[PDB]
Amino acid sequence: MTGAVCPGSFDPVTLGHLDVFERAAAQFDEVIVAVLINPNKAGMFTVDERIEMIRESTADLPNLRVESGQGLLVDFVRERGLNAIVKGLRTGTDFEYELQMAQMNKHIAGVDTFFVATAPAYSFVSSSLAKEVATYGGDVSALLPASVHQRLLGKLRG
Amino acid sequence: MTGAVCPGSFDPVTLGHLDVFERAAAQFDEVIVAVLINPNKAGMFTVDERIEMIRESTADLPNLRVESGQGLLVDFVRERGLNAIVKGLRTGTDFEYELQMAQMNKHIAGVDTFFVATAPAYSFVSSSLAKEVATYGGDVSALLPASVHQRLLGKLR
Amino acid sequence: MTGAVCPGSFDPVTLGHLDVFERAAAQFDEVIVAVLINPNKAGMFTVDERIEMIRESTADLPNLRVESGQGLLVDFVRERGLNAIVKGLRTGTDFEYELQMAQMNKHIAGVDTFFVATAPAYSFVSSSLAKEVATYGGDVSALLPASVHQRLLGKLRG
Amino acid sequence: MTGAVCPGSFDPVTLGHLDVFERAAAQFDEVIVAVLINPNKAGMFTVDERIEMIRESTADLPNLRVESGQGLLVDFVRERGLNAIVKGLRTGTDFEYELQMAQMNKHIAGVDTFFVATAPAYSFVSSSLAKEVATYGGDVSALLPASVHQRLLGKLRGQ
Amino acid sequence: MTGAVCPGSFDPVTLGHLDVFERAAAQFDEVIVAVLINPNKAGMFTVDERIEMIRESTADLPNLRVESGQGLLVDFVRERGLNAIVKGLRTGTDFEYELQMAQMNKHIAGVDTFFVATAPAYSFVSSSLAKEVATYGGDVSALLPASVHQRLLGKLR
Amino acid sequence: MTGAVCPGSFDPVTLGHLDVFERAAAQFDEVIVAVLINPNKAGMFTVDERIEMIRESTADLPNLRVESGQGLLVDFVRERGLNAIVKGLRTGTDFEYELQMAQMNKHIAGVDTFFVATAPAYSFVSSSLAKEVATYGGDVSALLPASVHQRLLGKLRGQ
Ligand SMILES: CC(C)(COP(=O)(O)OP(=O)(O)OC[C@@H]1O[C@@H](n2cnc3c(N)ncnc32)[C@@H](O)[C@@H]1OP(=O)(O)O)[C@@H](O)C(=O)NCCC(=O)NCCS
Ligand SMILES: CC(C)(COP(=O)(O)OP(=O)(O)OC[C@@H]1O[C@@H](n2cnc3c(N)ncnc32)[C@@H](O)[C@@H]1OP(=O)(O)O)[C@@H](O)C(=O)NCCC(=O)NCCS
Ligand SMILES: CC(C)(COP(=O)(O)OP(=O)(O)OC[C@@H]1O[C@H](n2cnc3c(N)ncnc32)[C@@H](O)[C@H]1OP(=O)(O)O)[C@@H](O)C(=O)NCCC(=O)NCCS
Ligand SMILES: CC(C)(COP(=O)(O)OP(=O)(O)OC[C@@H]1O[C@H](n2cnc3c(N)ncnc32)[C@@H](O)[C@H]1OP(=O)(O)O)[C@@H](O)C(=O)NCCC(=O)NCCS
Ligand SMILES: CC(C)(COP(=O)(O)OP(=O)(O)OC[C@H]1O[C@@H](n2cnc3c(N)ncnc32)[C@@H](O)[C@@H]1OP(=O)(O)O)[C@@H](O)C(=O)NCCC(=O)NCCS
Ligand SMILES: CC(C)(COP(=O)(O)OP(=O)(O)OC[C@H]1O[C@@H](n2cnc3c(N)ncnc32)[C@@H](O)[C@@H]1OP(=O)(O)O)[C@@H](O)C(=O)NCCC(=O)NCCS
């Protein structure tokens, strides 16, 4: 009956993210991807756009589901009967802040955080950098799920 | 007679800050906590409210006083006859930026900076993260002085 | 049927280690502590001494067992039908090397590594520093399992 | 035919930047300082002011030129027939972000990035921190080229 | 005419090293790989064997040559009319120590050091870890040049 | 009655160390340089040589004294009625290890550790790297006090 939550803003989800999802799904009975949107800064995609892109990318993971959340991440995790978070590490990760959030989350609700390093091929993509490169005409297609890539072109052509 | 300045925005003061204050007060004859506002941010608490919360938290430290400041930190320090800064290190501290400021402050005014690591129990609280957790209904009472936590719930309600 | 391996030299096991064991045991169905002794540098305790100290400390973890290993860690993990490693992070951890080993281990055998930050109270103990402090007469009793503490005094009084 | 681009916003150029420019100019046949502009963000100095400050402080480097641009850095580099970037490292550099950008730039365009440590004397100045200290009256004259310092004081005193 | 030295013990050369060599050879007119032995370690391969493995791996790089050296690195560099070093960065690199050596080398001889990040695929191999994995029967063939991997299995058998 | 201990093996003392000694002496009433010896590891200089090199280079600091010791650092500190350590930070410092030691020393004896960044000019010298460069004939004269340099050359030329 094990389980973990993979949280993030996922604007959009990248192959770095998907790699983390897959490993979480391989090692825990149940995985929930929590789409948690920053309230002070709306992004490129709407919440249900973000959710759809993740669902499309994770169709081959039977024990994974995708839900949006508001408020504390630890409440999202516990309200679903779990108490484990899985986060990815990549080139550019602010690991010090990850550690700060991990300790805070453990303190306030007893939720553990597990970190896993993303695959080297996907270690340098992030949502913001992929969007920036794409805005300026660069090819980030090898770093994003195919479904995301087309939607991203749409949002930019607009 | 020795002395140091403990600068920050303290919005609000945390037990991590208080740990640093106590260590500075134990090792220097005089400590001045300098409450310095970022001119384009305002924050949650007013300067007066911040000073009041620090004073209540440092009531047992007779050689420490609290004062607002504006302008260059090193001017604040030197104008009070001192030339040392004491800064805390916690989980999430941008240490590279602390080092850059320390080198800059030494270069422009000859002021030294001493860093001290906060206690493990208080190493993951920061003003911003405490406010964010509190905003969403999380309990950060063990990470803040008693006076702060009450005032915090007040600004949120 | 989930499971993870917690590897190390554990010379001796500390409360930092025990914290990691407990979280692994809370989040995976099955946990194995692998005692892997460096072949070029014997330590303070023998392998079976190290094992005994861990077993004594982990008696309240039903789904945890302790075994010694030789050769590749990834072979230890896979020969037991698992493919997940759990490692602790503390103050002083060479995280860059942990990342290097994690990527290598994933490359050569498809084994994932999950990192978890130890509790603040136990974040500054390590085997080597605890031994050094103890050698010079300092009190590290709050940082080690009670069983370990007495054995450590014995090895030093010798 | 070797060459490298030294990119940045240079608002304003510092002695840390100049140190890096000089290393690059000593080790590559040609160097181009790329003053990259976000057309949406103004900054303190106009693109012409930024270029003039750099040119005045690099006059003794005959193989270095200064050009502005926008959009992708790797496009600026490749359209000049080059595929190397030289970036400086200082105290306060977000090196993890530099690594991410270097890996991304290599991936999308085959462009290499070489990092060099700025000299100790110039290792704690940045454009933003110099601007901040000067705003509050601190003396940053030893950290900026002469082409910059009084121009900076002029911008600040003009509110 | 420009040039750089790529120094190391290369015991053995890895594809991470080779990636760095290729980038240096693409950007400088002349590259010299300097094989420098730690005088109290000997290692797995002799200096001659190390040079041979590098030469086989860099056969397509006509402006790169391989040479053993001893003594101060900056002397090796300056004696060959150059004053640049190129070093690779990988996962596990002690970057703080690289920076210290780079500053020292610039101070004592005016020699510059340029760092370049190795490709992601080759970012987690190192000479020591490859040998350790290979010793215990693990397959590191994708992380080493072909010539190296064969010679490696040989020294182990 | 304020005071701090500046500990280390100082084999030999560097200008980086001296910079830290000077900061400590300016900010605490008394400073003790603790030359800590492992009785099993010899090092290059004897304890008397290490102390003499430090004393010759600190003669202008009237509130600083030099004493050797072994065993726990916190015992050395507390037996002098103090409970502060001052440590320098330089390029190449293992800061994570410094933090671990600082937390351990606080835990076992209530002793505080204050870190200070060494001046840029002296930020890349360490005892071991200076010894290594000098061994191979490099010029480290600008990174060591005069009390050290020729003594170092003497040790090396004596094989
Ligand atoms: C949702 C939450 C976890 C997001 O935090 P986060 O882990 O730092 O991740 P974010 O969504 O902000 O985004 C950072 C990401 O890094 C990248 N990233 C994250 N995971 C990645 C991965 N596996 N691979 C590649 N890149 C990744 C980016 O994609 C993205 O950054 P970018 O915008 O620069 O591209 C956090 O804000 C949260 O918990 N919110 C709920 C409120 C709360 O509980 N607050 C108290 C916290 S203690
Ligand atoms: C067994 C092995 C994982 C040990 O590596 P390691 O994770 O770095 O851990 P180690 O046992 O060497 O010891 C480091 C530890 O850090 C500390 N430590 C480790 N985990 C800790 C924790 N959870 N809490 C507190 N401290 C901890 C120490 O206790 C100890 O160091 P110390 O001796 O300085 O006290 C590794 O060497 C290995 O895999 N060996 C098998 C051979 C192999 O597969 N090699 C190829 C690897 S890719
Ligand atoms: C222009 C570019 C090279 C950035 O240059 P940079 O030197 O790395 O950083 P910049 O020059 O833009 O920014 C200013 C620097 O950061 C500083 N800074 C100040 N506040 C900062 C903050 N909150 N965050 C980050 N940097 C800050 C400045 O002080 C300055 O430091 P410096 O004086 O030493 O140079 C990079 O943004 C780029 O390539 N843009 C083109 C678009 C592109 O190609 N994107 C894809 C990248 S993979
Ligand atoms: C003595 C003590 C303070 C260490 O001092 P330190 O300045 O932090 O480091 P040391 O002086 O011993 O060691 C030499 C330094 O590391 C260097 N060094 C060289 N090779 C090194 C290596 N392989 N690893 C680590 N350091 C190395 C030296 O160059 C030197 O740097 P520096 O010149 O800038 O000072 C610490 O070991 C101690 O407190 N010992 C007493 C016993 C004790 O209390 N133990 C409990 C500690 S919690
Ligand atoms: C006041 C001053 C010392 C900054 O203080 P600081 O402690 O280093 O930084 P702050 O006071 O803002 O504190 C950091 C805090 O900001 C908040 N914060 C949130 N997000 C942040 C972010 N992205 N960046 C910075 N701070 C952030 C708090 O979380 C946080 O930590 P803390 O609560 O544990 O202290 C500095 O700005 C200063 O000297 N100002 C005077 C002007 C001057 O002299 N400038 C020249 C300096 S060389
Ligand atoms: C030759 C020299 C450049 C060192 O090279 P380096 O690449 O920085 O370090 P090495 O060549 O040993 O390479 C590091 C390698 O050591 C091995 N290694 C294993 N454990 C190690 C450890 N704890 N520390 C260092 N290296 C280790 C390899 O794993 C490893 O990485 P790599 O295979 O990816 O390159 C340097 O020692 C030198 O300049 N020597 C000449 C003398 C001199 O001039 N000294 C003054 C320098 S300022």
Author numbering:
A (entry chain C), C (entry chain C): 1 to 158
B (entry chain B), E (entry chain B): 1 to 157
D (entry chain A), F (entry chain A): 1 to 159
Publication passage describing the model:
In this study, we explore M. abscessus phosphopantetheine adenylyl transferase (PPAT), an enzyme involved in the biosynthesis of Coenzyme A, as a target for the development of new antibiotics. Phosphopantetheine adenylyltransferase (PPAT or CoaD) catalyses the penultimate step in the biosynthesis of CoA in prokaryotes. The enzyme catalyses the reversible transfer of an adenylyl group from ATP to 4′-phosphopantetheine (PhP) to yield 3′-dephospho-CoA (dpCoA) and pyrophosphate. Further studies on M. tuberculosis show the essential role played by the coaD gene in mycobacterial growth in vitro, confirming the potential of PPAT as an antibiotic target.
Previous studies on E. coli PPAT have shown that Coenzyme A (CoA), the end-product of the biosynthetic pathway, acts as feedback inhibitor of the PPAT enzyme catalyzed reaction. To further understand the binding mode of CoA, we determined the crystal structure of Mab PPAT in complex with CoA. CoA and the enzyme product 3′-dephospho CoA (dpCoA) differ only by the presence of a 3-phosphate on the ribose ring. A structural superposition of the Mab PPAT CoA structure with that of dpCoA bound form determined, previously within our research group, shows that the pantetheine moiety of CoA and that of dpCoA adopts a similar conformation in the Mab PPAT active site. On the contrary, the adenosine moieties of CoA and dpCoA do not coincide in the Mab PPAT active site. The adenine ring along with the 3′-phosphate group of CoA is found largely exposed to the central solvent filled channel in Mab PPAT-CoA structure whereas in Mab PPAT-dpCoA, the adenine ring adopts a different position near the catalytic Arg90. Further, the adenyl moiety of CoA exhibits high B-factors in comparison to that of the dpCoA complex, suggesting greater movements of this moiety in CoA-bound Mab PPAT. This could be attributed to the steric hindrance in the molecule imparted by the additional phosphate group of CoA. Whereas in apo, PhP-bound and CoA-bound PPAT structures, the solvent channel adopts an open conformation and has a predominantly negative charge distribution from the acidic groups like Asp-94 and Glu-96 that are exposed to the channel.
